[PDB]
Amino acid sequence: VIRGNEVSQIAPGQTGNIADYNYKLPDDFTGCVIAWNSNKLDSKPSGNY
Amino acid sequence: YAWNRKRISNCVADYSVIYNFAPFFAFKCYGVSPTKLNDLCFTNVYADSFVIRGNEVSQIAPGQTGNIADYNYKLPDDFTGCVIAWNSNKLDSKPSGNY
Amino acid sequence: PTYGVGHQPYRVVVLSFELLHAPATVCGPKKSTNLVKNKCVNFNFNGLTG
Known part of the structure; x- marks a missing residue:
């Protein structure tokens, strides 16, 4: 999450913050990227830490 | 019609x-x-x-026509650079109407 | 929940497929047909036809 x-950073040949330190896709990636919003379940009034 | 233009230089x-x-x-x-x-x-x-x-x-593009791009703000055909667009529903909305 | 729409959480699922010369250990629900030989026909072997 x-x-x-x-x-947009989840792409082959991409840099940044998540793509450079956390999760880097391979340059010959074969697969699918699925993303959807989770505002109902991953939000708290006091802050989700 | 009267959009601001800010020049950024020497930083x-x-x-x-x-x-x-x-x-x-x-x-x-x-x-x-x-x-x-x-x-x-x-x-x-x-x-x-x-x-x-x-x-x-979608009219913020080179080689585009319409209402904004034909009378208000036309981008050049060889434009390069980045365009940032975000909504202002929580900052520029009024119940009687934002006129 | 009071933030903008560009800062909301997103559930990201990454699925990757292996496309190599290995035999198909796991794949989808398709039906197999009995094998015959010595005829000009069309075949289908592990996802590739001919």
């Missing part, structure tokens, strides 16, 4:  | 902090990649600011 600003 | 621009400043979907660039703006560097940077309707967000 990541924020909505890094949906 | 150092860090382009990685834009994502933590506004809640935008696509950091829409045309001739450059967003993550390689730190290594290469340009001559001058321009900054513009305006608010349009949701039906004319």
Whole structure:
């Protein structure tokens, strides 16, 4: 689960913050990337830490 | 019709902090990649600011016609750079109407 | 929940398929047909036809 600003970062040949330190896709990736919003279950009034 | 134009000159621009400043979907660039703006560097940077309707967000493109692009703000045919667009429902909406 | 729409959480599921010369250990629900030989026909072997 990541924020909505890094949906475009999940791509082969991509850099940034998540793609450079956390999760890097291979340059010959064969598969599918599935992302959807989870605002109902991954949100708290006091902050989800 | 009277959109602001801000000239940015003689400083150092860090382009990685834009994502933590506004809640935008696509950091829409045309001739450059967003993550390689730190290594290469340009001559001058321009900054513009305006608010349009949701039906004319797709009109912010070179070689485009319509209402904004034909009478209000026409991008050049050889435009390069990044365009940032995010909604302002929680900041510029009024119950009687934002006129 | 009071943030903008560009800072909402997103559930990301990454699925990857192996496309190599290995035999198909796991794959989808398709029906197999009995094998005959010595005829100009069309075949289908592990996803590739001919």
